Amino acid sequence: YEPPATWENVDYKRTIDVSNAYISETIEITIKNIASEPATEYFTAFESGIFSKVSFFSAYFTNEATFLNSQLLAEIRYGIIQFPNAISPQEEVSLVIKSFYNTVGIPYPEHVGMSEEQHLLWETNRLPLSAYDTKKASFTLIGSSSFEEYHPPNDESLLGKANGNSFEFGPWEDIPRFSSNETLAIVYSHNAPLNQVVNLRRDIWLSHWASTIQFEEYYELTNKAAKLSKGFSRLELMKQIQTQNMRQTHFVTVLDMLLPEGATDHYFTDLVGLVSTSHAERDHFFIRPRFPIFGGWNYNFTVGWTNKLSDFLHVSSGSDEKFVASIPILNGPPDTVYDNVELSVFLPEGAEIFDIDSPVPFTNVSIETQKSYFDLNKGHVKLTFSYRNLISQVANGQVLIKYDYPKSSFFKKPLSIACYIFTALMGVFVLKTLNMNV
Amino acid sequence: MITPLDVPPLDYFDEVFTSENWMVRIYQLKKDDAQGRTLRDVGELTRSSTKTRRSIKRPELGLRV
Amino acid sequence: RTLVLYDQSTEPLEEYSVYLKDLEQRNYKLEYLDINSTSTTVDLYDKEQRLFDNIIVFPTKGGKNLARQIPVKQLIKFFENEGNILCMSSPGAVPNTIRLFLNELGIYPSPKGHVIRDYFSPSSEELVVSSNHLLNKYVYNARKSEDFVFGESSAALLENREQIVPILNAPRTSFTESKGKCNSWTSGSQGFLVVGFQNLNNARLVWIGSSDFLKNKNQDSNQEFAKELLKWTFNEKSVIKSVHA
Amino acid sequence: TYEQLYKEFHSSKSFQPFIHLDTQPKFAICGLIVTLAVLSSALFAVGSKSSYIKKLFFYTILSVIGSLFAGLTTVFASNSFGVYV
Ligand SMILES: CCCCC/C=C\C/C=C\CCCCCCCC(=O)O[C@H](COC(=O)CCCCCCCCCCCCCCC)COP(=O)([O-])OCC[N+](C)(C)C
Ligand SMILES: *[C@@H]1O[C@H](CO)[C@@H](O[C@@H]2O[C@H](CO)[C@@H](O)[C@H](O)[C@H]2NC(C)=O)[C@H](O)[C@H]1NC(C)=O
Ligand SMILES: *[C@@H]1O[C@H](CO)[C@@H](O[C@@H]2O[C@H](CO)[C@@H](O)[C@H](O)[C@H]2NC(C)=O)[C@H](O)[C@H]1NC(C)=O
Numbered sequence: 001y002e003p004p005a006t007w008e009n010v011d012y013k014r015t016i017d018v019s020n021a022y023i024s025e026t027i028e029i030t031i032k033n034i035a036s037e038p039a040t041e042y043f044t045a046f047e048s049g050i051f052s053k054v055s056f057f058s059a060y061f062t063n064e065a066t067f068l069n070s071q072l073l074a075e076i077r078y079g080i081i082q083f084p085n086a087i088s089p090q091e092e093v094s095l096v097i098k099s100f101y102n103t104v105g106i107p108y109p110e111h112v113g114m115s116e117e118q119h120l121l122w123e124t125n126r127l128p129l130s131a132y133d134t135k136k137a138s139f140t141l142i143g144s145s146s147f148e149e150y151h152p153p154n155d156e157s158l159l160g161k162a163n164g165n166s167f168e169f170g171p172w173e174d175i176p177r178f179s180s181n182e183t184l185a186i187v188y189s190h191n192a193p194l195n196q197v198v199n200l201r202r203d204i205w206l207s208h209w210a211s212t213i214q215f216e217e218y219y220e221l222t223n224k225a226a227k228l229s230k231g232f233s234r235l236e237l238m239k240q241i242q243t244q245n246m247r248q249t250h251f252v253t254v255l256d257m258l259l260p261e262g263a264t265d266h267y268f269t270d271l272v273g274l275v276s277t278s279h280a281e282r283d284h285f286f287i288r289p290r291f292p293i294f295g296g297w298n299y300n301f302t303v304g305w306t307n308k309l310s311d312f313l314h315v316s317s318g319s320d321e322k323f324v325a326s327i328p329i330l331n332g333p334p335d336t337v338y339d340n341v342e343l344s345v346f347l348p349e350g351a352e353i354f355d356i357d358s359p360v361p362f363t364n365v366s367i368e369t370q371k372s373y374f375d376l377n378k379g380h381v382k383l384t385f386s387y388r389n390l391i392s393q394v395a396n397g398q399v400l401i402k403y404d405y406p407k408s409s410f411f412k413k414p415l416s417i418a419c420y421i422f423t424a425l426m427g428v429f430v431l432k433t434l435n436m437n438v
Numbered sequence: 439m440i441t442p443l444d445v446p447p448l449d450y451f452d453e454v455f456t457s458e459n460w461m462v463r464i465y466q467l468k469k470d471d472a473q474g475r476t477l478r479d480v481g482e483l484t485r486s487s488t489k490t491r492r493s494i495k496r497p498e499l500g501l502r503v
Numbered sequence: 504r505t506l507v508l509y510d511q512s513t514e515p516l517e518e519y520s521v522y523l524k525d526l527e528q529r530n531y532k533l534e535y536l537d538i539n540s541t542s543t544t545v546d547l548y549d550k551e552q553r554l555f556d557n558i559i560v561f562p563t564k565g566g567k568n569l570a571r572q573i574p575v576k577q578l579i580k581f582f583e584n585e586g587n588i589l590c591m592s593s594p595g596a597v598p599n600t601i602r603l604f605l606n607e608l609g610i611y612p613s614p615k616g617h618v619i620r621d622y623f624s625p626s627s628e629e630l631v632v633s634s635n636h637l638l639n640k641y642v643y644n645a646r647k648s649e650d651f652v653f654g655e656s657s658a659a660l661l662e663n664r665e666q667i668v669p670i671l672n673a674p675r676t677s678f679t680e681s682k683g684k685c686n687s688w689t690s691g692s693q694g695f696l697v698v699g700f701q702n703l704n705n706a707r708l709v710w711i712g713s714s715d716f717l718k719n720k721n722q723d724s725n726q727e728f729a730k731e732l733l734k735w736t737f738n739e740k741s742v743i744k745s746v747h748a
Numbered sequence: 749t750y751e752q753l754y755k756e757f758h759s760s761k762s763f764q765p766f767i768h769l770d771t772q773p774k775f776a777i778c779g780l781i782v783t784l785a786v787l788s789s790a791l792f793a794v795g796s797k798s799s800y801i802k803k804l805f806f807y808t809i810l811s812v813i814g815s816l817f818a819g820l821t822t823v824f825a826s827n828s829f830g831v832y833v
């Protein structure tokens with residue numbers, strides 16, 4: 001399937017940024033309608049693998065400040081951008097498209113030393129892949145210090161030139177549609193750790209009796225940087241430390257968690273006990289694992305803290321029993337990528353959920369119950385969201401939940417404990433009012 | 439007192455982890471040679487470069503079976 | 504895929520054209536290099552990635568060039584990374600790096616100046632050996648009797664390793680004659696003219712102690728033996744696979 | 749729907765606790781004393797050698813009071829130890 005060619009591209013400028021552990025792409029597109037029928041839709045081309053690895057996708061006008069309706073569609077795959085007001089059959093449009101993928105270049109030399117610099121190999125299509133023909137194009141690469149090509153082609157036009165921290169490619173002036181044949185393989189220098197959270201289980205517990213919100217996060221972290229040739233030698237690591245080589249190294253020594261303002265009662269444990277190397281500073285929680293995380297190593301751990309409920313939960317204006325909570329979806333290290341997120345919110349026993357919404361599309365949502373420390377009844381209402389490809393500081397939205405919690409349900413918990421105790425007391429009385437003498 | 443000439447090298451094991459205060463040390467048994475040479479002779483081969491490697495003479499090996 | 508190393512001063516590449524063309528016939532791609540008139544060194548590896556599946560070394564008098572091209576360490580690294588090897592070293596054309604690399608494999612060829620002599624031979628001009636001395640049917644066993652021309656050749660001593668595969672040994676009445684006073688290197692069945700070696704990673708090497716075996720002259724007597732010998736050494740003839748244990 | 753809920757959340761008053769956490773420890777220490785007193789009295793009534801029709805009445809009323817107190821103090825003490833309900 002191909003979308004009809006209702007548009008033509010005046011100019012195409014693709015800039016790829018490789019500074020972080022994820023690939024960011026901005027396209028400057030100028031389009032004009034070529035048919036007489038007015039069309040409000042534009043289609044974006046993505047390869048199957050890139051489509052699967054897309055995390056974030058948005059677009060807007062080069063002039064306006066608000067975003068249009070840009071939705072992915074579910075073997076080139078397509079995203080659709082919808083226009084608010086239809087266009088003339090022959091008129092100009094200036095779009096700016098932004099995307100963030102969950103992929104990154106693999107280390108070209110897979111095994112390097114403890115102090116050697118790292119290089120990554122990233123493979124992307126070189127000419128613009130689109131379903132609408134383009135009469136002008138350009139490509140740029142930013143974010144790194146050095147760029148080289150792996151097996152370059154003979155044709156001079158299919159080659160690029162260097163600027164300062166930049167790599168511009170050929171300014172071609174006629175490209176047909178679906179011309180994704182030549183594949184470019186670039187090698188760049190990235191000397192930082194590549195953090196990958198394979199699974200996050202984030203649990204938020206809300207309590208009206210204590211007026212607190214408690215956050216418990218379970219991370220399963222890996223490092224996708226170059227593996228260590230010759231194995232780990234604590235002597236070499238100590239000789240690097242005492243040499244005061246604070247250079248940007250590609251192994252994790254300390255993580256910095258950014259928490260909501262006013263957090264208290266921090267803790268940092270793992271599957272084997274409590275880790276003592278953690279230190280809290282305003283809004284920041286610095287954490288040192290038991291061992292440094294070199295390329296290819298795993299580390300599963302748990303962090304937690306507490307906050308005041310009055311910052312996330314507000315009361316409806318129509319009644320004093322309808323509450324609206326706005327809960328952040330991610331609170332983690334600065335530069336990290338997530339592959340599976342399960343976000344659970346626990347509302348008190350007698351709460352009935354009335355409305356739910358997420359700022360970004362989720363893969364699943366569910367509601368159940370779970371018993372806790374004093375839940376003699378059914379237990380806390382557990383609302384679970386499932387998300388797939390999330391990036392640390394581009395998924396900064398907040399989930400909105402509107403629920404109901406009457407005063408009856410508020411007071412019913414001490415009542416349940418009292419009924420349990422009263423039943424035990426009646427049982428004691430019964431046991432002390434009948435004789436078993438012979 | 440320990441001197442760097444006291445500890446001979448390991449040719450059959452490889453250090454994979456040493457704790458921060460050196461209390462626990464974990465080694466891994468290396469896999470055997472594809473050619474069938476002893477790990478001791480691979481180690482000697484690595485630790486030795488001599489111009490006059492050896493004389494022409496002949497091996498004292500036994501009968502091929 | 505295949506890299507052929509030929510020293511022009513010892514024996515020209517043209518002489519061994521017969522079997523090389525047959526490699527093109529079986530879809531092999533090839534690259535040539537002469538060490539007599541080369542300046543830059545061959546690059547076997549490109550960032551932990553070898554660029555040749557096979558390597559063929561033709562008769563050569565060892566010197567600075569061979570050592571520069573393929574040191575013993577690089578040869579062992581290539582062989583350990585599933586690379587196949589074919590070696591040739593005749594009396595008067597035996598290098599030192601090849602001899603050392605074979606000594607690391609448990610194969611000890613005779614040095615320069617030692618030659619095989621057999622008086623009870625049907626040939627007074629050259630060295631000839633019948634198919635009676637074939638030692639492994641999984642490499643080559645002739646359906647009918649034959650004889651192979653070897654000429655001035657050498658022999659090797661072998662160890663008791665699982666990985667060594669003796670292919671063709673010297674005749675029973677043969678012996679090693681040295682120009683000097685050296686004790687005879689070999690004697691009888693304990694000398695071998697064609698030997699093989701299989702890595703534990705299933706790489707393969709074959710060593711032939713004669714420069715005459717693959718020459719275009721002996722095309723009539725050694726064509727098949729050589730053809731399926733080249734088939735064996737390149738993991739093309741007798742490879743096995745196990746499925747669904 | 750996201751828009752409307754966002755506007756609501758951003759145009760409402762915050763959450764006001766029923767009883768502040770800082771106060772709950774005192775309330776727990778006081779309710780524990782009251783619970784101990786009442787329950788220990790009803791055990792005296794169980795030991796009493798008086799009629800059955802009146803021992804039942806006194807025990808039931810005293811337990812219906814002590815249990816309310818004990819539940820309230822259980823909530824307060826749990827909240828004060830760091831285990832929020
Ligand atoms: C029969 C009467 C006996 C009288 C004596 C009673 C207690 C002994 C005195 C002091 C002990 C309190 C110190 C322990 C609390 C801190 C340790 C901790 O905090 O550990 C807790 C384990 O929770 C516990 O089990 C503590 C139980 C709380 C007991 C409070 C005592 C008042 C109620 C007494 C029982 C009344 C009977 C009612 C039956 C209907 C860590 O929980 P977590 O890691 O899952 O974090 C949870 C965080 N999320 C939820 C986000 C994952
Ligand atoms: C720590 O977390 C990692 C990451 O999820 C776990 O690694 C997975 O383990 C399962 C079972 O062994 C494998 O099937 C997966 O392939 C592993 N994934 C990766 C990316 O390695 C690991 O099991 C966890 N360890 C503990 C003790 O919980
Ligand atoms: C969304 O809800 C759950 C995610 O927890 C999944 O469906 C259930 O998955 C559990 C996990 O084993 C099963 O025991 C249940 O039988 C599944 N079905 C139900 C109805 O609970 C799944 O990811 C999603 N379910 C959908 C889309 O129906």
Ligand SMILES: *[C@@H]1O[C@H](CO)[C@@H](O)[C@H](O)[C@H]1NC(C)=O
Pocket residue numbers: 511512539540
């Ligand atoms: C290299 O060139 C020829 C090539 O066959 C060879 O015979 C000769 O001995 C070598 N040296 C010189 C100087 O030609």
